[PDB]
Amino acid sequence: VKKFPEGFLWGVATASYQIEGSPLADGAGMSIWHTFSHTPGNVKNGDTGDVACDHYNRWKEDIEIIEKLGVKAYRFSISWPRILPEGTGRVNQKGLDFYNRIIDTLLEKGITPFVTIYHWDLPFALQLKGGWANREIADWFAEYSRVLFENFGDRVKNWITLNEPWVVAIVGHLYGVHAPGMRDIYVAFRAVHNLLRAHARAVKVFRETVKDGKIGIVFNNGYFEPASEIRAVRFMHQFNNYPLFLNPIYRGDYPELVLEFAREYLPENYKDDMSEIQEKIDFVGLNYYSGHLVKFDPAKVSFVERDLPKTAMGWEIVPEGIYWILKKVKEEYNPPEVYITENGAAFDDVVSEDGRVHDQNRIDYLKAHIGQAWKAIQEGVPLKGYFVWSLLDNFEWAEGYSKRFGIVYVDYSTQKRIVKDSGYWYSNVVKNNGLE
Numbered sequence: 001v002k003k004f005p006e007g008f009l010w011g012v013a014t015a016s017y018q019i020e021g022s023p024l025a026d027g028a029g030m031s032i033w034h035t036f037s038h039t040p041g042n043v044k045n046g047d048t049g050d051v052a053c054d055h056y057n058r059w060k061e062d063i064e065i066i067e068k069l070g071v072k073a074y075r076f077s078i079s080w081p082r083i084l085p086e087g088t089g090r091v092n093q094k095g096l097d098f099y100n101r102i103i104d105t106l107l108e109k110g111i112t113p114f115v116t117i118y119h120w121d122l123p124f125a126l127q128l129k130g131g132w133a134n135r136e137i138a139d140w141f142a143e144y145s146r147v148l149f150e151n152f153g154d155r156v157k158n159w160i161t162l163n164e165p166w167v168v169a170i171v172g173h174l175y176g177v178h179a180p181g182m183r184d185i186y187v188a189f190r191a192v193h194n195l196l197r198a199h200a201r202a203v204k205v206f207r208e209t210v211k212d213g214k215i216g217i218v219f220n221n222g223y224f225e226p227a228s229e230i231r232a233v234r235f236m237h238q239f240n241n242y243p244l245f246l247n248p249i250y251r252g253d254y255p256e257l258v259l260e261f262a263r264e265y266l267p268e269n270y271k272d273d274m275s276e277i278q279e280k281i282d283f284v285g286l287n288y289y290s291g292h293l294v295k296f297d298p299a300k301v302s303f304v305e306r307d308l309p310k311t312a313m314g315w316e317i318v319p320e321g322i323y324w325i326l327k328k329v330k331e332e333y334n335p336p337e338v339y340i341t342e343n344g345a346a347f348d349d350v351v352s353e354d355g356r357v358h359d360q361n362r363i364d365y366l367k368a369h370i371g372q373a374w375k376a377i378q379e380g381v382p383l384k385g386y387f388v389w390s391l392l393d394n395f396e397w398a399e400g401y402s403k404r405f406g407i408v409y410v411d412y413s414t415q416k417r418i419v420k421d422s423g424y425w426y427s428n429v430v431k432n433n434g435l436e
């Protein structure tokens with residue numbers, strides 16, 4: 001058997017724009033994912049978040065599903081433009097009401113809320129003023145965060161400033177594949193820097209406003225292995241994984257190979273902001289999905305396709321990656337607490353004639369990764385919790401509804417939820433507090 005520590009937090013994770021639908025209900029402002037998904041060519045099949053999982057109406061049902069599965073923590077995000085329709089200034093009480101009902105319900109049912117403040121749905125009104133490219137976002141973000149703390153901080157005690165600021169900056173502003181759909185490397189790195197400053201401003205406000213809770217930040221991570229016998233792997237780690245943000249947070253500068261590549265793209269006096277950026281955080285969230293073979297190639301790095309099982313995303317399944325990144329984060333920055341805030345897989349799920357979804361591929365994926373996280377705990381990593389991405393099949397960004405990551409299947413024509421075998425399997429893992 002592989003049992004986890006007593007009080008280990010088994011969770012599932014979602015994001016507002018991916019599940020909610022009704023993006024314009026009850027006075028909500030438009031978000032950049034509203035405007036991006038409504039722009040032709042940006043998202044597969046013209047898919048948008050207009051309806052998604054209709055969680056905006058079905059939230060109680062979905063929470064009752066979390067409850068009945070015995071899952072102990074729910075990670076979800078708040079839509080900034082539901083709360084502040086223009087991003088700053090006016091507060092929308094109906095937006096607050098929506099999340100208040102979700103929060104109270106979870107608490108009533110003994111489920112621990114983990115709130116992601118920003119999971120990519122920036123108010124459109126602020127994108128007009130430059131979004132993450134504008135230094136003033138540190139103030140906008142801090143004022144938004146202050147509102148959340150004041151309203152919910154009596155009940156929510158676990159907070160995440162940013163989901164994957166690497167993706168926000170690079171995929172949103174260099175690759176142009178995500179909202180706001182830009183391709184400018186100087187904008188992208190100014191977004192990197194500004195995300196840090198906004199995160200640190202929000203942590204600071206948190207200490208003034210919520211004196212009994214905890215706050216952290218979430219990073220995407222890949223397990224990069226070299227194609228031969230390598231500095232390219234060092235670069236990929238420092239650029240794509242937690243060091244881009246943790247070196248500033250813990251050591252007060254960007255990682256060495258990030259500076260070699262991107263110094264010219266960062267603001268000229270960026271070190272002026274580093275001491276503020278070092279604001280103390282309580283935990284690191286790591287998201288992990290995939291491993292990559294990497295070689296130097298005249299960013300001077302390209303990927304090598306390997307055999308190896310892949311998911312529907314074409315992501316190579318490499319379970320030892322989650323152990324590696326867990327070990328490496330302790331070794332490099334030794335944060336006091338770590339959570340796996342997302343781990344999961346997209347497979348081509350089908351409802352069998354028996355009415356069930358027989359996702360053995362997903363069970364195998366989760367089991368392998370849960371086992372590798374168990375190992376990291378035996379070897380001393382302060383891992384406090386683990387979150388499956390995702391509770392539900394949902395809007396998978398530029399892929400639309402075509403990629404299914406849920407442990408619960410959503411039939412989009414009816415909004416029917418069907419617990420997949422992986423969801424039942426995970427329930428038993430949570431009940432048993434580990435594997436066997």
Ligand SMILES: COC(=O)Cc1c[n+]2c([nH]1)[C@H](O)[C@@H](O)[C@H](O)[C@H]2CO
Nearest residue numbers: 015163164167220221287289389396
């Ligand atoms: C480059 O590293 C990554 O993008 C890892 C990653 C995967 N995922 C996320 N990040 C987001 O937090 C979720 O909103 C997605 O639905 C989920 C699945 O694609």
